Amino acid sequence: STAGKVIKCKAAVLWEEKKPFSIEEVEVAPPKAHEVRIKMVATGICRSDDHVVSGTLVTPLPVIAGHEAAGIVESIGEGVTTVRPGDKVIPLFTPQCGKCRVCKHPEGNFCLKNDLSMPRGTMQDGTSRFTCRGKPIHHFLGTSTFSQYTVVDEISVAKIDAASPLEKVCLIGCGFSTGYGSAVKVAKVTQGSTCAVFGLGGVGLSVIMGCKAAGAARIIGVDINKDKFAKAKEVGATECVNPQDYKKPIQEVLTEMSNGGVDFSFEVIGRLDTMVTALSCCQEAYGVSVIVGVPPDSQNLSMNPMLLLSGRTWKGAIFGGFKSKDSVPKLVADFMAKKFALDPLITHVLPFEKINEGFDLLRSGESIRTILTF
Amino acid sequence: STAGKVIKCKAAVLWEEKKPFSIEEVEVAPPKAHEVRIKMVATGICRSDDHVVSGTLVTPLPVIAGHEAAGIVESIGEGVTTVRPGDKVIPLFTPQCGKCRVCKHPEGNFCLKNDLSMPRGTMQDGTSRFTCRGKPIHHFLGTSTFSQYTVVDEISVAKIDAASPLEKVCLIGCGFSTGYGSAVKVAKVTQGSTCAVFGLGGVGLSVIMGCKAAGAARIIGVDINKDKFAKAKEVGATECVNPQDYKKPIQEVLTEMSNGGVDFSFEVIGRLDTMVTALSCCQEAYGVSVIVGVPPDSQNLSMNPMLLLSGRTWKGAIFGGFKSKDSVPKLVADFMAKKFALDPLITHVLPFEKINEGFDLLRSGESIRTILTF
Ligand SMILES: NC(=O)C1=CN([C@@H]2O[C@H](COP(=O)(O)OP(=O)(O)OC[C@H]3O[C@@H](n4cnc5c(N)ncnc54)[C@H](O)[C@@H]3O)[C@@H](O)[C@H]2O)C=CC1
Ligand SMILES: NC(=O)C1=CN([C@@H]2O[C@H](COP(=O)(O)OP(=O)(O)OC[C@H]3O[C@@H](n4cnc5c(N)ncnc54)[C@H](O)[C@@H]3O)[C@@H](O)[C@H]2O)C=CC1
Ligand SMILES: O=CNCc1ccccc1
Ligand SMILES: O=CNCc1ccccc1
Ligand SMILES: [Zn+2]
Ligand SMILES: [Zn+2]
Ligand SMILES: [Zn+2]
Ligand SMILES: [Zn+2]
């Protein structure tokens, strides 16, 4: 009944940095050619959404944030082939156009149509589908999921299993898949190895899950908040260390614990200092360190290239290195076969209208993921 | 007849940074247990030896430098099992002890017995085999080849083919193998890829050789000295670029030349700025950059970690990633079988006594490798 019409609905609009979201009425345009309009069912609160509020992650404002979600297709624009009305879907914050040099590369996933490197906060066509208070509102990573309805480009949505539980599999839209794939696909963690995971939020827990799945022998979780440790051990950490408990710098501690450095280390926080520390704690000749955390905008780190000349490998990735539209349906299929677990990441469920409470839970240290239900 | 006796011979001693080498009469002690005394036959002049003169590379002084060499075993100490008197040998500036965690790892080559990370300028036992007028002289990377005779630990020497031409295969001891392995083993250059090689000295030429052997379709050489370009093209460069010719940064030039970034880049100079340019010029989602050059002591580079978060891989290596004692004999066997050429790297041949002329040639930009003969 809403097909072809403007929808009036509620959305959490961010008008300014360092302010609460404003839940208010927005207008959602119908989809144009090759666009899909989605009724949201569930969306998670990712630290990257909070980085938009804090200015850590720059994107044009005002904006409808949110990018870790699941919903149901309300309507399709002309020419859409990959989803239909009524389909369950996960929006893809990293698109898969399938035509660019990256999408054609066997190892690349950072499609050239992304809105991450040089964010414009628009649809692919350079326009917005959202109006609020008579003003156009920006999109966020081609997703914008903090709204009862959103419109996405076809290359930014994946059809998933019709029986999927949307209030869990929304995590496959960002935090689970990012962590998991950072271990299994990007680092390529090996059986019997020693891993160190810096940051034990939802993404870092998912990195632990991937390390465990890969057969790591030792998985050392590192966090300054010791309340994170219990859950990290439940999902596979063999030891947890709090850097504040030690007189020596933590790279020194880890190098000792691992008899000369770890095989794989992961930065899952977003601090320049910890990126360098995590690189330093992997074994100097054959260690690999993966940056997963989002750094403060435009800031450089400083490091001694001798850390690399001895033989370390340093890399980063977006979305766990997964080709998004290929991988998300498969991940969902795997979750419904119970190949991995999502419940350990979900600490809190709230209705969408309590989004600001959800962000307070994250900021205070209390939650891993809060799922918002519409 | 000299076995078990002190040898008096000439060696080139570096007493002070930024001075010429001094040809001195030195005393070379006989080898102690698990040590090998070698009569030199040929030694190349590598930029890393110059780095000791310039203070780029810090190692205790006074010192006998030289590390890219071949010779003949004059005698062996008690318990030596891998070489005998009369054998042709290449000293190994990176050892292969066979027992440490790196030697046991399939990929690692930076054996924990190395004298690179925290240089002591001694034999493994913490002492020197060289004296000049009563004063102990330090060793260099457990090799010290700018001498008519040297003493090395058994873990720092490999036996090679009895028929091999020592005045050529000395380059397997450092520059050739470092460049070639950086391409074929560390980067794992693929068929049909685009490569960019920063620095077209002996090591960079060997990188080009390796890229061509791996089947690269495009190999872009980058040097500020356009006199290096002809030889780079002879050994497989498809194009050469001088950053001084352009009114914009070379990473932008290379990114446009490669239609969005190269597949593999190599820093083969030793400058922090070129390390960051080389990383930048490889494709943001799937590019790999390898640091080969030796940076100035204790200096840090500055870089934006978003270069890695997109998907780039940054690594470095010593000695092309080769496990030294296993690989050097095989590389010599491959040269004897015409699998690669060494003559394109040799521009000058001089008697040992003319070492300072050899260094003048390197510093002026005229030479690639000067081989010093005994
Ligand atoms: N590369 C990618 O595609 C993606 C990156 N991100 C990023 O990953 C990072 C983690 O995301 P979440 O798990 O959602 O965040 P989170 O905030 O829940 O977890 C981060 C953890 O780091 C810990 N921490 C903070 N400072 C620390 C320090 N100095 N040392 C050790 N631990 C410290 C916190 O106590 C917390 O448990 C964020 O920067 C986020 O923006 C998330 C998703 C996708
Ligand atoms: N990682 C390893 O195991 C090893 C590393 N090294 C290092 O590799 C580097 C290369 O050694 P060689 O080939 O013997 O040296 P080289 O001095 O013959 O060649 C370096 C080249 O860099 C070029 N160059 C200098 N400044 C430049 C700039 N700003 N931009 C572009 N080109 C520039 C020069 O014109 C020269 O042709 C040195 O730093 C050396 O210490 C060499 C052997 C082993
Ligand atoms: O959390 C999801 N996406 C945000 C993101 C921003 C920049 C880099 C990686 C990820
Ligand atoms: O040229 C060979 N070795 C010198 C060297 C010193 C430090 C790091 C790598 C190599
Ligand atoms: Zn694409
Ligand atoms: Zn996220
Ligand atoms: Zn070893
Ligand atoms: Zn060298």
Tab-separated table of C-alpha atoms in Angstrom, chain A:
chain	number	residue	atom	x	y	z
A	1	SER	CA	0.000	0.000	0.000
A	2	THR	CA	2.951	2.414	0.333
A	3	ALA	CA	4.492	1.444	-3.031
A	4	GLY	CA	5.212	4.472	-5.163
A	5	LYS	CA	4.398	6.858	-2.352
A	6	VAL	CA	6.400	9.010	0.024
A	7	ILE	CA	6.471	7.458	3.402
A	8	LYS	CA	6.237	9.512	6.587
A	9	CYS	CA	7.939	7.695	9.408
A	10	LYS	CA	10.187	8.097	12.472
A	11	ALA	CA	13.959	8.294	12.217
A	12	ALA	CA	16.826	9.156	14.524
A	13	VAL	CA	18.354	12.203	12.979
A	14	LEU	CA	21.819	13.506	13.983
A	15	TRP	CA	21.766	17.231	13.387
A	16	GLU	CA	25.091	18.060	15.056
A	17	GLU	CA	28.143	16.396	16.511
A	18	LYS	CA	28.199	15.489	20.179
A	19	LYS	CA	24.420	15.718	20.554
A	20	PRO	CA	21.763	13.109	21.206
A	21	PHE	CA	19.859	11.666	18.261
A	22	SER	CA	16.547	13.369	17.586
A	23	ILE	CA	13.678	10.996	16.987
A	24	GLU	CA	11.396	12.755	14.607
A	25	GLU	CA	9.270	12.532	11.538
A	26	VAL	CA	11.034	12.151	8.238
A	27	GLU	CA	9.839	11.721	4.689
A	28	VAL	CA	11.223	8.728	2.741
A	29	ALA	CA	10.999	9.004	-1.018
A	30	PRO	CA	10.048	5.941	-3.122
A	31	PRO	CA	12.926	4.058	-4.765
A	32	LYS	CA	14.221	5.164	-8.124
A	33	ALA	CA	15.687	2.845	-10.728
A	34	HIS	CA	17.956	0.257	-9.178
A	35	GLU	CA	17.023	1.219	-5.628
A	36	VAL	CA	15.296	-0.710	-2.869
A	37	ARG	CA	13.125	0.606	-0.037
A	38	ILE	CA	13.364	-1.428	3.167
A	39	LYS	CA	11.202	-1.615	6.258
A	40	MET	CA	13.650	-1.974	9.135
A	41	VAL	CA	13.161	-4.819	11.609
A	42	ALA	CA	16.290	-4.614	13.795
A	43	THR	CA	19.501	-2.579	13.902
A	44	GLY	CA	22.533	-2.831	16.094
A	45	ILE	CA	24.490	-0.058	17.766
A	46	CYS	CA	28.061	-0.242	16.444
A	47	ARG	CA	30.906	1.846	17.819
A	48	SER	CA	31.242	3.326	14.333
A	49	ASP	CA	27.825	4.953	14.666
A	50	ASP	CA	29.094	6.540	17.851
A	51	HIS	CA	32.214	7.706	15.970
A	52	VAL	CA	29.874	9.755	13.777
A	53	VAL	CA	28.492	11.466	16.911
A	54	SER	CA	31.962	12.101	18.334
A	55	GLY	CA	33.507	13.310	15.050
A	56	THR	CA	35.971	10.413	15.028
A	57	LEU	CA	34.417	9.279	11.757
A	58	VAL	CA	33.553	12.180	9.480
A	59	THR	CA	30.519	12.060	7.302
A	60	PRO	CA	28.263	14.884	6.162
A	61	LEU	CA	25.602	16.094	8.697
A	62	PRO	CA	22.725	16.175	9.246
A	63	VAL	CA	22.566	12.410	8.768
A	64	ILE	CA	20.534	9.294	9.455
A	65	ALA	CA	23.223	6.945	10.836
A	66	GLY	CA	23.005	3.226	11.408
A	67	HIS	CA	24.535	0.589	9.192
A	68	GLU	CA	24.260	-2.810	11.007
A	69	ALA	CA	20.679	-3.950	10.321
A	70	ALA	CA	18.120	-6.282	8.854
A	71	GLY	CA	14.694	-5.644	7.324
A	72	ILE	CA	12.084	-6.530	4.788
A	73	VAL	CA	11.809	-5.080	1.299
A	74	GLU	CA	8.796	-2.760	1.053
A	75	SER	CA	9.253	-1.898	-2.681
A	76	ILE	CA	11.747	-2.005	-5.575
A	77	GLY	CA	12.568	0.562	-8.193
A	78	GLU	CA	12.706	-0.174	-11.938
A	79	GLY	CA	15.330	-2.633	-13.052
A	80	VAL	CA	15.977	-4.275	-9.664
A	81	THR	CA	16.563	-8.018	-10.089
A	82	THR	CA	18.192	-9.327	-6.932
A	83	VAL	CA	15.500	-8.759	-4.383
A	84	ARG	CA	11.700	-8.540	-4.387
A	85	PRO	CA	9.059	-7.105	-2.110
A	86	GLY	CA	8.703	-9.196	0.999
A	87	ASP	CA	12.286	-10.490	0.919
A	88	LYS	CA	14.387	-10.383	4.078
A	89	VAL	CA	17.537	-8.307	3.496
A	90	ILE	CA	20.669	-6.945	5.091
A	91	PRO	CA	21.955	-3.598	3.915
A	92	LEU	CA	25.597	-3.584	2.938
A	93	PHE	CA	27.733	-0.663	4.193
A	94	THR	CA	30.405	-1.897	1.744
A	95	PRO	CA	28.720	-2.347	-1.637
A	96	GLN	CA	29.449	-5.038	-4.240
A	97	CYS	CA	28.949	-3.580	-7.663
A	98	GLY	CA	30.476	-6.719	-9.240
A	99	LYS	CA	31.974	-4.696	-12.162
A	100	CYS	CA	34.887	-2.649	-10.749
A	101	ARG	CA	38.556	-3.768	-10.658
A	102	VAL	CA	38.230	-4.516	-6.933
A	103	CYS	CA	35.028	-6.513	-7.186
A	104	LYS	CA	36.700	-8.588	-10.000
A	105	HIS	CA	39.866	-9.171	-7.864
A	106	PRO	CA	39.878	-12.478	-5.958
A	107	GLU	CA	41.054	-10.813	-2.698
A	108	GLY	CA	39.514	-7.335	-2.861
A	109	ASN	CA	36.283	-6.341	-1.191
A	110	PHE	CA	36.470	-2.531	-0.943
A	111	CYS	CA	34.317	-1.829	-3.961
A	112	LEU	CA	35.017	1.407	-5.773
A	113	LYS	CA	31.365	2.492	-5.356
A	114	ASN	CA	31.791	2.742	-1.569
A	115	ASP	CA	30.907	5.889	0.319
A	116	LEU	CA	33.603	5.347	2.942
A	117	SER	CA	36.836	6.872	1.507
A	118	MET	CA	35.377	10.204	0.314
A	119	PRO	CA	31.938	10.275	1.969
A	120	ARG	CA	29.230	12.190	0.186
A	121	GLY	CA	26.303	10.772	2.330
A	122	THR	CA	24.101	10.274	-0.718
A	123	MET	CA	22.617	7.567	-2.833
A	124	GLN	CA	24.783	6.460	-5.824
A	125	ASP	CA	23.084	9.144	-7.932
A	126	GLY	CA	24.315	11.941	-5.645
A	127	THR	CA	20.901	12.738	-4.134
A	128	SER	CA	19.114	11.923	-0.865
A	129	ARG	CA	15.859	10.044	-0.317
A	130	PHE	CA	15.296	11.609	3.111
A	131	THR	CA	13.674	14.925	4.048
A	132	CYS	CA	13.206	16.231	7.624
A	133	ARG	CA	11.914	19.719	8.625
A	134	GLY	CA	11.809	20.426	4.908
A	135	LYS	CA	15.572	19.854	4.549
A	136	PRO	CA	17.446	17.059	2.762
A	137	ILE	CA	19.176	14.663	5.216
A	138	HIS	CA	22.313	12.692	4.403
A	139	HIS	CA	22.609	8.982	4.088
A	140	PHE	CA	25.374	7.048	5.948
A	141	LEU	CA	27.521	4.452	4.050
A	142	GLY	CA	24.691	3.905	1.600
A	143	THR	CA	22.646	2.272	4.408
A	144	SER	CA	21.034	4.641	7.020
A	145	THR	CA	19.329	2.154	9.246
A	146	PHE	CA	18.280	4.333	12.221
A	147	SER	CA	14.920	4.826	10.497
A	148	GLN	CA	11.724	2.848	10.235
A	149	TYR	CA	12.294	2.879	6.441
A	150	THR	CA	15.364	3.447	4.308
A	151	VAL	CA	16.246	3.397	0.615
A	152	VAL	CA	19.454	1.772	-0.612
A	153	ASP	CA	21.076	1.100	-3.953
A	154	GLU	CA	20.763	-2.433	-5.225
A	155	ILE	CA	24.535	-3.009	-4.954
A	156	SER	CA	24.156	-2.215	-1.182
A	157	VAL	CA	21.609	-4.905	-0.263
A	158	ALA	CA	21.671	-8.671	0.028
A	159	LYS	CA	18.722	-11.033	0.014
A	160	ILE	CA	18.922	-13.480	2.886
A	161	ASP	CA	17.089	-16.664	3.952
A	162	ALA	CA	13.285	-16.189	4.250
A	163	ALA	CA	13.346	-17.907	7.744
A	164	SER	CA	16.217	-15.792	9.157
A	165	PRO	CA	15.787	-14.274	12.658
A	166	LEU	CA	16.303	-10.631	11.828
A	167	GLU	CA	16.817	-9.485	15.443
A	168	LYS	CA	20.040	-11.626	15.524
A	169	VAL	CA	21.351	-11.646	11.898
A	170	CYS	CA	21.511	-7.836	11.718
A	171	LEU	CA	24.953	-8.363	13.359
A	172	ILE	CA	26.105	-10.082	10.130
A	173	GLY	CA	25.672	-6.584	8.579
A	174	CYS	CA	28.700	-5.285	10.477
A	175	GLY	CA	30.269	-6.332	13.703
A	176	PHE	CA	30.218	-10.153	13.532
A	177	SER	CA	31.294	-10.443	9.978
A	178	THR	CA	34.004	-7.787	10.392
A	179	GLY	CA	35.618	-9.536	13.334
A	180	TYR	CA	35.174	-13.047	12.133
A	181	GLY	CA	36.494	-12.396	8.702
A	182	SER	CA	39.416	-10.309	10.010
A	183	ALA	CA	40.598	-13.589	11.599
A	184	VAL	CA	39.600	-16.183	9.082
A	185	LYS	CA	40.022	-14.360	5.829
A	186	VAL	CA	42.320	-11.386	6.352
A	187	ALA	CA	44.843	-12.659	8.863
A	188	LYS	CA	44.197	-16.322	7.852
A	189	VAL	CA	44.805	-17.557	11.408
A	190	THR	CA	46.396	-21.017	11.447
A	191	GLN	CA	45.737	-24.103	13.573
A	192	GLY	CA	47.781	-24.134	16.725
A	193	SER	CA	48.760	-20.483	16.625
A	194	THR	CA	48.826	-17.760	19.310
A	195	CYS	CA	46.592	-14.695	18.701
A	196	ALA	CA	46.286	-11.328	20.643
A	197	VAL	CA	43.083	-9.386	20.264
A	198	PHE	CA	43.116	-5.755	21.400
A	199	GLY	CA	39.560	-4.600	22.267
A	200	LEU	CA	36.840	-6.935	23.503
A	201	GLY	CA	33.669	-5.263	22.221
A	202	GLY	CA	31.400	-6.868	19.700
A	203	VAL	CA	33.927	-6.774	16.909
A	204	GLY	CA	36.798	-8.052	19.062
A	205	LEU	CA	34.636	-10.862	20.399
A	206	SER	CA	33.896	-11.785	16.862
A	207	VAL	CA	37.624	-11.809	16.091
A	208	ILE	CA	38.025	-14.273	18.969
A	209	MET	CA	35.283	-16.415	17.532
A	210	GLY	CA	37.123	-16.500	14.196
A	211	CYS	CA	40.444	-17.306	15.824
A	212	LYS	CA	38.842	-20.174	17.713
A	213	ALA	CA	37.198	-21.432	14.536
A	214	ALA	CA	40.550	-21.362	12.778
A	215	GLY	CA	41.930	-23.590	15.553
A	216	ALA	CA	44.201	-21.147	17.396
A	217	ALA	CA	45.812	-22.699	20.463
A	218	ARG	CA	46.047	-19.471	22.498
A	219	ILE	CA	43.877	-16.398	22.209
A	220	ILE	CA	44.904	-13.530	24.494
A	221	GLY	CA	42.265	-10.845	24.926
A	222	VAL	CA	43.467	-7.339	25.867
A	223	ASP	CA	41.179	-4.658	27.268
A	224	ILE	CA	41.463	-1.898	29.850
A	225	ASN	CA	37.935	-2.750	31.058
A	226	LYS	CA	38.248	-6.030	32.986
A	227	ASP	CA	34.403	-6.462	32.888
A	228	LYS	CA	34.897	-7.544	29.298
A	229	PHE	CA	36.941	-10.554	30.200
A	230	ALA	CA	34.276	-13.021	31.245
A	231	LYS	CA	32.516	-12.905	27.878
A	232	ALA	CA	35.780	-12.977	25.940
A	233	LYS	CA	36.670	-16.250	27.729
A	234	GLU	CA	33.182	-17.676	26.988
A	235	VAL	CA	33.707	-17.181	23.256
A	236	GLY	CA	37.239	-18.543	23.222
A	237	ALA	CA	39.888	-16.386	24.877
A	238	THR	CA	42.338	-18.587	26.736
A	239	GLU	CA	43.785	-15.612	28.779
A	240	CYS	CA	42.871	-11.945	29.257
A	241	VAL	CA	45.213	-9.149	30.199
A	242	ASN	CA	44.499	-5.604	31.324
A	243	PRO	CA	47.422	-3.282	30.404
A	244	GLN	CA	46.691	-1.181	33.551
A	245	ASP	CA	47.723	-4.131	35.738
A	246	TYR	CA	51.342	-4.156	34.458
A	247	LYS	CA	54.344	-1.914	34.938
A	248	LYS	CA	55.818	-2.830	31.503
A	249	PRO	CA	54.176	-1.743	28.235
A	250	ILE	CA	51.711	-4.335	27.020
A	251	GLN	CA	53.669	-5.233	23.830
A	252	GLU	CA	56.479	-6.376	26.201
A	253	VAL	CA	54.082	-8.388	28.342
A	254	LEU	CA	52.543	-10.135	25.289
A	255	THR	CA	55.931	-10.829	23.706
A	256	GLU	CA	56.982	-12.503	27.001
A	257	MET	CA	53.728	-14.472	27.380
A	258	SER	CA	54.093	-15.794	23.801
A	259	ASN	CA	57.800	-16.736	24.063
A	260	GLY	CA	58.930	-14.068	21.615
A	261	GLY	CA	55.747	-12.557	20.025
A	262	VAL	CA	52.352	-13.679	18.857
A	263	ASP	CA	51.537	-15.225	15.414
A	264	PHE	CA	48.560	-12.912	14.779
A	265	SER	CA	47.532	-9.672	16.498
A	266	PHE	CA	44.399	-7.568	15.902
A	267	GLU	CA	43.706	-3.905	16.731
A	268	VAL	CA	39.966	-3.710	17.394
A	269	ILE	CA	39.706	-0.380	19.228
A	270	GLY	CA	40.535	2.528	16.985
A	271	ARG	CA	43.558	4.158	18.697
A	272	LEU	CA	46.782	5.067	16.926
A	273	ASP	CA	48.865	3.918	19.921
A	274	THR	CA	47.285	0.504	20.099
A	275	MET	CA	47.772	0.018	16.338
A	276	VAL	CA	51.482	0.386	16.874
A	277	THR	CA	51.486	-1.721	20.058
A	278	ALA	CA	49.525	-4.502	18.381
A	279	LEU	CA	52.026	-4.529	15.459
A	280	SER	CA	54.981	-4.601	17.919
A	281	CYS	CA	53.583	-7.656	19.830
A	282	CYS	CA	53.520	-9.977	16.848
A	283	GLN	CA	56.649	-12.005	16.260
A	284	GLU	CA	59.234	-9.876	14.454
A	285	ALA	CA	60.095	-12.292	11.683
A	286	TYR	CA	56.776	-13.844	10.723
A	287	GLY	CA	53.994	-12.141	12.762
A	288	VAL	CA	50.882	-10.603	11.166
A	289	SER	CA	48.943	-7.675	12.577
A	290	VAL	CA	45.541	-6.611	11.330
A	291	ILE	CA	44.031	-3.202	11.958
A	292	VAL	CA	40.276	-3.384	12.361
A	293	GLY	CA	39.561	-0.259	14.544
A	294	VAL	CA	38.585	3.042	12.942
A	295	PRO	CA	41.184	5.757	13.625
A	296	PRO	CA	40.325	9.408	14.499
A	297	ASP	CA	39.802	11.323	11.307
A	298	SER	CA	42.826	12.559	9.390
A	299	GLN	CA	45.343	11.679	12.078
A	300	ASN	CA	48.668	9.982	11.362
A	301	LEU	CA	50.521	7.496	13.452
A	302	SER	CA	54.241	7.332	13.956
A	303	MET	CA	56.210	4.099	13.801
A	304	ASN	CA	59.648	2.633	13.305
A	305	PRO	CA	59.811	0.799	9.898
A	306	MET	CA	62.339	-1.606	11.409
A	307	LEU	CA	59.222	-3.330	12.862
A	308	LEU	CA	58.378	-4.295	9.289
A	309	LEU	CA	61.900	-4.832	7.857
A	310	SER	CA	62.434	-7.810	10.214
A	311	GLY	CA	59.552	-9.588	8.465
A	312	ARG	CA	56.229	-8.521	10.045
A	313	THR	CA	53.145	-8.081	7.922
A	314	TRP	CA	50.741	-5.252	8.657
A	315	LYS	CA	47.374	-5.017	7.051
A	316	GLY	CA	43.855	-3.709	7.591
A	317	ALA	CA	40.462	-4.438	6.175
A	318	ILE	CA	36.904	-3.283	5.957
A	319	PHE	CA	34.080	-5.697	6.781
A	320	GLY	CA	36.430	-8.623	7.477
A	321	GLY	CA	37.591	-8.732	3.913
A	322	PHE	CA	34.264	-10.225	2.784
A	323	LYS	CA	32.830	-9.485	-0.682
A	324	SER	CA	29.662	-8.211	0.854
A	325	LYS	CA	26.780	-9.308	-1.363
A	326	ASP	CA	28.291	-12.756	-2.009
A	327	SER	CA	29.129	-13.345	1.567
A	328	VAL	CA	26.284	-12.037	3.687
A	329	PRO	CA	23.665	-14.634	2.441
A	330	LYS	CA	26.190	-17.429	3.059
A	331	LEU	CA	26.961	-16.119	6.530
A	332	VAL	CA	23.266	-16.103	7.351
A	333	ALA	CA	22.970	-19.729	6.032
A	334	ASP	CA	25.888	-20.654	8.263
A	335	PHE	CA	24.277	-18.999	11.270
A	336	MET	CA	21.040	-20.871	10.709
A	337	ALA	CA	23.088	-24.132	10.583
A	338	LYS	CA	24.611	-22.996	13.908
A	339	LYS	CA	28.197	-22.776	12.551
A	340	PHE	CA	28.686	-19.734	14.734
A	341	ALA	CA	26.832	-17.967	17.515
A	342	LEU	CA	25.480	-14.370	17.744
A	343	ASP	CA	23.725	-14.412	21.125
A	344	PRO	CA	27.000	-13.948	23.060
A	345	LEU	CA	27.295	-10.497	21.339
A	346	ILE	CA	23.782	-9.338	22.218
A	347	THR	CA	23.659	-7.951	25.737
A	348	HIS	CA	20.682	-5.620	25.511
A	349	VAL	CA	17.500	-5.269	23.439
A	350	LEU	CA	15.601	-2.032	23.256
A	351	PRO	CA	12.854	-0.515	21.189
A	352	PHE	CA	14.137	1.931	18.506
A	353	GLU	CA	12.676	4.914	20.423
A	354	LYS	CA	15.238	4.326	23.201
A	355	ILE	CA	18.242	4.724	20.843
A	356	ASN	CA	19.874	7.316	23.049
A	357	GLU	CA	19.783	4.908	25.999
A	358	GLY	CA	21.405	2.345	23.687
A	359	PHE	CA	24.240	4.770	22.998
A	360	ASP	CA	24.584	5.529	26.725
A	361	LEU	CA	24.947	1.767	27.351
A	362	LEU	CA	27.770	1.571	24.800
A	363	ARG	CA	29.545	4.657	26.044
A	364	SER	CA	29.441	3.580	29.736
A	365	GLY	CA	31.118	0.283	28.983
A	366	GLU	CA	28.108	-1.818	29.901
A	367	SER	CA	26.985	-3.270	26.600
A	368	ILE	CA	28.493	-5.265	23.772
A	369	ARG	CA	25.676	-4.948	21.222
A	370	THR	CA	22.303	-3.401	21.849
A	371	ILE	CA	19.750	-4.437	19.248
A	372	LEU	CA	17.093	-1.855	18.492
A	373	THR	CA	13.688	-3.280	17.356
A	374	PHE	CA	11.258	-1.217	15.273
